Design a protein around this ligand. Structure first.
Ligand SMILES: O=C(CCCN1CCC(O)(c2ccc(Cl)cc2)CC1)c1ccc(F)cc1
Ligand SMILES: CCCCCCCC/C=C\CCCCCCCC(=O)O
Ligand SMILES: CCCCCCCC/C=C\CCCCCCCC(=O)O
Ligand SMILES: CCCCCCCC/C=C\CCCCCCCC(=O)O
Ligand SMILES: CCCCCCCC/C=C\CCCCCCCC(=O)O
Length: 421
């Protein structure tokens, strides 16, 4: 009916979005990065689906059954599985290239490496698909490989779940790595402002503290003050701590500071509103003056919530807080405006996009392999009317990816507008 015309334009927008991505990467040196090279390899898998495969899927909707040779169906199924597996194996290499960038310290060596990855993606995609042409070691095929009971079991495990687990395990490791550095930079930030002390010392208000504003005990008794420290370290403090031990002590101070921020009605919303780095600045304030003290200049706090970065910085400089510790105030206020650690970077934003495509990829195809589980779980025969929608939802992912590139990235965005105009 009229539904055939929607899909052919879906094929057209898949080609529209991806042909842009390929040229845009090779057009500008600023987008010629390891990850973006792996991204065009993903774009080529999304193009070959739209050109080699999706046309036969639309005829199958139009006509309503195969109505072509058995071997044509084998080729069509083999190639359909092959290009979707390239899509998955490309996400896997993208995540791995994101692991290396955040976790490892690279000119000609990057091009020679990415090359090796891309070569693995397609060769393996192919070698995984070759069984479908030779009837999954089942001779007298006598039928399109789709009809083999093992087909859904082979294609689901080998081409989806197993690449899905690995890519997910990498992203977890990436999250852990970024989490250690984010906590590393906080400690490093307050080491610069408060100062790191490794011998027990009387603080401003008289009580004995150590490291970065960690009071051992409100009660002043030196041997008793050692006492609380000894509980913390486990070794005989003897009033002596390592940088490391202080940091371990520091991350505890941060975690306590944060629960109080969320338990504070004046600071819960604004903390929730801010980004990771800007949150480290707000932590710096609570460390310096206390949540009740930071909870003041609500007037200034509204601006940080309203994303008014420039106007919050103008209003913060007006304070007494600036007058007492101007250098520290200016440093922190930059981090509030800049939202970066320049006062005291590139790949954390880029790695957020990588996971974002790997996530919408999964949600786009997830229901398709869900339904296939239900039939294998012998559940009430799943209506085909839905079964077809889930196929296209999976194929829709080919058109969403170039939309995500331009959405969450300025460089693809600018490279795109240059080609059109
Ligand atoms: O493999 C797939 C999804 C099935 C594609 N493909 C849809 C059409 C199909 O359902 C079909 C139906 C009827 C006929 Cl006749 C031929 C083919 C065969 C399977 C895949 C998806 C995501 C991924 F990360 C890895 C692999
Ligand atoms: C081919 C399918 C691959 C499936 C991959 C699934 C990935 C899901 C997304 C993210 C979960 C882990 C967090 C990723 C790190 C993000 C960095 C950060 O914001 O700290
Ligand atoms: C079935 C899941 C397997 C996932 C594989 C996905 C493809 C990309 C992954 C790995 C290739 C890594 C090659 C790196 C070579 C480095 C050589 C060098 O340092 O020059
Ligand atoms: C089932 C998953 C198996 C593969 C895991 C994928 C993640 C990491 C992949 C491989 C490790 C890459 C190491 C490259 C070694 C090159 C050494 C060299 O030549 O200097
Ligand atoms: C058994 C499941 C396997 C899961 C492995 C994936 C989890 C680890 C995360 C990423 C590994 C990336 C390694 C890339 C390093 C390249 C340099 C080198 O290997 O010498």
């Amino acid at each position: 009916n009229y539904y055939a015309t929607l899909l052919t334009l879906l094929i057209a927008v898949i080609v529209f979005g991806n042909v842009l991505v390929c040229m845009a990467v090779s057009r500008e040196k600023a987008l010629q990065t390891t990850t973006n090279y792996l991204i065009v390899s993903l774009a080529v898998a999304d193009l070959l689906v739209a050109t080699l495969v999706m046309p036969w899927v639309v005829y199958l909707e139009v006509v309503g059954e195969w109505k072509f040779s058995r071997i044509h169906c084998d080729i069509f199924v083999t190639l359909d599985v092959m290009m979707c597996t390239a899509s998955a194996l490309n996400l896997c290499a993208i995540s791995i290239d994101r692991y290396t960038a955040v976790a490892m310290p690279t000119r000609y060596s990057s091009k020679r490496r990415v090359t090796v990855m891309i070569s693995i993606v397609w060769v393996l995609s192919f070698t995984i698909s070759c069984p479908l042409l030779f009837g999954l070691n089942n001779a007298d095929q006598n039928e399109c490989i789709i009809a083999n009971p093992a087909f859904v079991v082979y294609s689901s495990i080998v081409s989806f779940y197993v690449p899905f687990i690995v890519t997910l395990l990498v992203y977890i490791k990436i999250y852990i790595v970024l989490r250690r550095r984010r906590k590393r930079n906080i400690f490093e930030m307050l080491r610069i402002d408060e100062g790191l002390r490794l011998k027990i010392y009387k603080d401003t208000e008289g009580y004995y503290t150590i490291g970065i504003g960690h009071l051992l005990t409100k009660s002043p008794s030196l041997n008793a003050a050692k006492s609380e420290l000894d509980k913390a370290i486990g070794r005989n403090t003897n009033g002596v701590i390592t940088k490391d031990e202080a940091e371990k002590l520091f991350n505890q101070d941060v975690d306590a500071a944060v629960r109080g921020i969320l338990r504070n009605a004046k600071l819960k919303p604004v903390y929730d509103s801010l980004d990771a780095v800007r949150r480290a600045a707000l932590i710096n304030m609570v460390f310096q003056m206390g949540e009740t003290g930071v909870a003041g200049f609500t007037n200034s706090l509204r601006m940080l919530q309203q994303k008014r970065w420039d106007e919050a910085a103008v209003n913060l400089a007006k304070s007494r807080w600036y007058n007492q510790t101007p250098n520290r105030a200016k440093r922190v206020i930059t981090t509030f405006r800049t939202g970066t650690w320049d006062a005291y970077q590139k790949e954390k934003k880029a790695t957020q996009m990588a996971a974002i495509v790997a996530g919408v990829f999964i949600i786009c195809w997830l229901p398709f392999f869900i339904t296939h589980i239900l039939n294998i779980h012998c559940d009430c025969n799943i209506p085909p009317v839905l079964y077809s929608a889930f196929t296209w939802l999976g194929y829709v992912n080919s058109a969403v990816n170039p939309i995500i590139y331009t959405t969450f990235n300025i460089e693809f965005r600018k490279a795109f507008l240059k080609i059109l105009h």
